[PDB]
């Protein structure tokens, strides 16, 4: 039955103000985040950055989008995300980023009957990584991904890793030829600026460089 669901989704979006967050003027909306790492393509020492491709999922509850007549989780077309409120999540250390757009924009909206929104994004991000090269090329590097809310303070938005330490998957999927992932960590902070305190999630990797290229390349010559 598609006519009753079309009346249900039109009921959810009628009178929906995208300018207002869920529970506007009340307690902060909690946004839970999961990251599935697709790949780390490049790690550049000259530019001091790294290119990361991931699936970025955000979970929050919007009571304006709660439906009752359907017992299923509504997976909608991704163009409905322009008619919904989404968190203003950005990457603080990110230098250049984009959402994939072939064949459609690489995003997903999945609704739930209590109003829980699953919002996924396929993002390729070139993030800055300041490197200590005093022990190069026998060095270990710590490259982070800083996840922050842009305009909403901690009075309006709260971040958390959804699933605790299992919130980031696909670290074994990373295949760098000159690097190996030693450890990854998940940090949740509040960062205070002049405009207020902002929620912060941090995903950091420890990169151990492989010596085998530099033996053939420089040491043995």
């Amino acid at each position, epitope marked *: 039955n598609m006519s009753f669901v079309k009346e249900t989704v039109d009921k959810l979006l009628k009178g929906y103000d995208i300018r207002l967050r869920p529970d506007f003027g009340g307690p902060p909306v909690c946004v839970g985040m999961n990251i599935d790492i697709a790949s780390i393509d490049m790690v550049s020492e000259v530019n001091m950055d790294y290119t990361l491709t991931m699936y970025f999922q955000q979970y929050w509850r919007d009571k304006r989008l709660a439906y009752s007549g359907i017992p299923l989780n509504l997976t909608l077309d991704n163009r409905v995300a322009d008619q919904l409120w989404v968190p203003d999540t950005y990457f*603080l*250390n990110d230098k250049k980023s984009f959402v994939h757009g072939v064949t459609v924009k690489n995003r997903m909206i999945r609704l739930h009957p209590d109003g829980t929104v699953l919002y996924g994004l396929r993002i390729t991000t070139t993030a800055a990584c*300041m490197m*200590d090269l005093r022990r190069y090329p026998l060095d270990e590097q*710590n490259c*982070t991904l*800083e996840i922050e809310s842009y305009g909403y303070t901690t009075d309006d938005i709260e971040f958390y890793w959804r699933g605790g330490d299992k919130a980031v998957t696909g670290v074994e999927r990373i295949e760098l030829p000159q690097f190996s992932i030693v450890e990854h960590r998940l940090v949740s*902070r*509040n*960062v*205070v*600026f*002049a405009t207020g*305190a902002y929620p912060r999630l*941090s995903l950091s990797f420890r990169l151990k460089r492989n010596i085998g290229y530099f033996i053939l390349q420089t040491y043995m010559p």
Partner: nanobody
Amino acid sequence: GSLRLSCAASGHTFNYPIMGWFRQAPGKEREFVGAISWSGGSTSYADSVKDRFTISRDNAKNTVYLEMNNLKPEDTAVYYCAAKGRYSGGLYYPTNYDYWGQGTQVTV
């Protein structure tokens, strides 16, 4: 008179490139005094201690020193030394600083 303090660091000081000096008067808030970068040396100061306090460092000893010149009776507090991560924002805010010093009680 002129009093010079000296804060020594050890460990992963590359991920914490900014050292900051804070003070906490008894019954008051923890007040920003000044900040210093390890690599470089770009300084920042509060208005109450500007052109009287000088902060600089040497990267050999991993030592940050706070030279307090032209002392005043409003400078009576436990002076703390703190380290700040790279993607933490705002020098003035002590919540952004992770590793703290012990804090010596200084009364002029």
